[PDB]
Design a protein around this ligand. Sequence first.
Ligand code: E4H
Ligand code: E4H
Ligand code: MG
Lengths: 277, 280
Amino acid sequence: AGMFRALFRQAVEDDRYGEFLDVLAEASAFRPQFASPEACSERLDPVLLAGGPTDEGRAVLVGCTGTAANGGPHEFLRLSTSFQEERDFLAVPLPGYGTGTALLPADLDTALDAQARAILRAAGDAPVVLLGHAGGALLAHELAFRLERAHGAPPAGIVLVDPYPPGHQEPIEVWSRQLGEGLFAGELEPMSDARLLAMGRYARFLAGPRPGRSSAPVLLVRASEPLGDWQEERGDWRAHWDLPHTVADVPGDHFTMMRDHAPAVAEAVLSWLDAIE
Amino acid sequence: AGMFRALFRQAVEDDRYGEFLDVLAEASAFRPQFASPEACSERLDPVLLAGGPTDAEGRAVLVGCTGTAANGGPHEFLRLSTSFQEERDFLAVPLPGYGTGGTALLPADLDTALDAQARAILRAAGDAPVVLLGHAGGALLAHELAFRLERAHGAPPAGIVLVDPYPPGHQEPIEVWSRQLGEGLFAGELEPMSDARLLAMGRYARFLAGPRPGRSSAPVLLVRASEPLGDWQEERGDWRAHWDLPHTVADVPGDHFTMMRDHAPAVAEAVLSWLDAIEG
Ligand SMILES: CC[C@H]1OC(=O)[C@H](C)[C@@H](O)[C@@H](C)C[C@@H](C)C(=O)/C=C/[C@H]1C
Ligand SMILES: CC[C@H]1OC(=O)[C@H](C)[C@@H](O)[C@@H](C)C[C@@H](C)C(=O)/C=C/[C@H]1C
Ligand SMILES: [Mg+2]
């Protein structure tokens, strides 16, 4: 495949994921960009992956696609099956990953505004609950804040599946080799250099200073098994969010909670939606 | 074809050449390397591009030190070398990291690459004194090689010809003309610059910007372009190439690029006169 993918493979092999991610972020600055939501080069139409029962005003779930360069429309497929007959589940694309390759957002807010527009159109009058996993969880919260601040529309809730926010990401840094190996393992096709640059650009966005906190209630879903080695004395390795409305612990690790154990995540979401409604 | 080449093209358009070179250098860290001269994946056998008179011996041979340009290679000294035919042997030595046959390993550090060049040159030159010659980045490389030959190989060259060098204390013209320098790289493409070769160029650029000993005892011929490559506001000062304490300075027609492209005979003429002066 491409040179960036080859370099990434080597970086992961040499346990230098973080350093390589910084290269991707810097390199992404030289890709053509969109500087306003209207200038976004791709159709961000959310896809309906599960349907709820017939016979307002029940919340609709919106899956916020994560940053993984091997990811895309397949991210929520396993999870979404458990929502069939329970809740409408829409997956929204992350701008800059589409195909000629898509323009990268100039900044995170520009991407979030593009997403917000597409979601509000698709959702209509139904309340929206945003859901994301890992980096996608961080993106879900940032989107929630933007919706509230700039679109007069705070979501009804946010489901954060294994978030590792700034100040709480030591375990994810320590396990970066596993994260990189997971990306290669999860390839259905070679990760394009264009998507690797998108991934770096969003990683850098999510590491920067962000502008405040959503008023929406949060469900924190945590994996129960560590992805890699962790000394007990070094503290809790688990995902974190400040003062969530509800915490749910599920089987599996950072990865397998969304595969093998996706029904457990779905079960936690469904119960919580009933409680907040 | 390749994303690094696409990015480079955009960086040039946006007048961010320097910034992108830094990205190339950082990215190069993740290419497979050679850490000892012997582990070099390429045959650095110099090519004889011109022959001196059969009449030899004790007479200096010229060694062309290939520069860092990603669009470069064996074609670099073809025009210049014709002017040495029947005057001086001219050997062109490849720069490690640019070859194919699969792509070549990058040097771990500059000294490792210089040691690989040094071994190939000494083998090729035999008993003959060596005068190193390089243009632009290749000129900086010629000096670094000369010092290494002296310090690590007991073999200081008889001389060094630096064609239009811009050393670390005098980089402003290269900075001001960076867009023009990048555009020249795409103009000089015989084929699309490979991502592997762009990374090699970034790696060497970083090497050359870093702490370098260390000063060759060999006498220097500084050859300078007489025309500015791009626009230059007069009060910035002197745009011309520079070297500290050269043995002799020669000015030739053309700019940074055309001095070698259109006026290579004038470069050759300067070298031949100086070689006679330092030998006789
Ligand atoms: C050294 C590995 C990095 O972690 C990531 O790349 C995670 C997986 C990703 O979600 C990215 C999108 C998380 C963001 C916030 C980031 O910059 C992370 C930096 C390191 C913790
Ligand atoms: C923005 C232009 C750059 O200059 C080069 O890349 C020149 C052409 C090259 O010889 C390089 C190999 C010269 C070295 C010293 C370098 O790293 C230069 C960096 C910038 C001044
Ligand atoms: Mg001086």
